[PDB]
């Protein structure tokens, strides 16, 4: 498995993540080997959501979040991805937030 | 401080105009509406047969204006109801 594209000597030495780097190589890598990739990819999508949450493009975030909820139901991001959009009156959402609280 | 700092324009949501919204009728089908208005950007996360449209603009170093459109459909994809919020409250 070509996991060599998810590291480097410098990125490895200082103990930092590579999840916010181009993820396309990890998707190619996808082909319990898939648990790591599941979360490495979900973190990417989450980080993008955070960027736009701070920037304020929350509608695109909502669509990305629905993509995450549909395609990765079992990752940590499913909780992390829950929230900028809540400034708008939405027919909330609350049932899934409460049902899976932990 | 923030109120005098330069900001790029913010553009979010889909385009809306009276020329198209005034043409939408109850009984009009999702294919006809999608043609007239364009592909929806938002939908119900739980599969409710309803469409939402949002037109939000905030010029740089200015405030934000937003209009929304709500479309309620039956099980056949035929619009049953409609609402609209021309401005934020």
């Amino acid at each position: 498995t070509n996991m060599a594209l998810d590291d480097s000597a410098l990125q490895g030495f200082f103990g930092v993540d590579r999840s916010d780097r181009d993820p396309q190589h990890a998707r190619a890598a996808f082909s319990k080997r898939l648990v790591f990739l599941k979360d490495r990819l979900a973190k990417y999508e989450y980080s993008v959501a955070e960027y736009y949450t701070e920037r304020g493009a929350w509608v695109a975030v909502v669509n990305r979040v629905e993509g995450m909820l549909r395609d990765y139901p079992d990752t940590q991001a499913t909780r992390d991805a829950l929230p900028a959009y809540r400034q708008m009156q939405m027919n909330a959402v609350a049932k899934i937030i409460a049902a899976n609280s932990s | 401080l923030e109120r005098v700092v330069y900001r790029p324009d913010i553009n979010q949501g889909n385009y809306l105009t009276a020329n198209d919204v005034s043409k939408i009728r109850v009984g009009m089908t999702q294919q006809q509406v999608a043609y007239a208005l364009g592909t929806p950007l938002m939908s119900d996360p739980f599969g409710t047969n309803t469409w939402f449209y949002v037109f939000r603009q905030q010029p740089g170093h200015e405030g934000v204006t937003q209009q929304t459109l709500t479309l309620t459909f039956n099980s056949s994809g035929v619009l049953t109801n409609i609402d609209n919020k021309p401005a934020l409250s």
Partner: peptide
Amino acid sequence: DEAYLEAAPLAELHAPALPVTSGDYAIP
């Protein structure tokens, strides 16, 4: 090298008393 060894469980969220889902990236 050991990061994958976390082996976090892939538990799905349960529905409240139904979100849109797909079958891509399935676990065989």
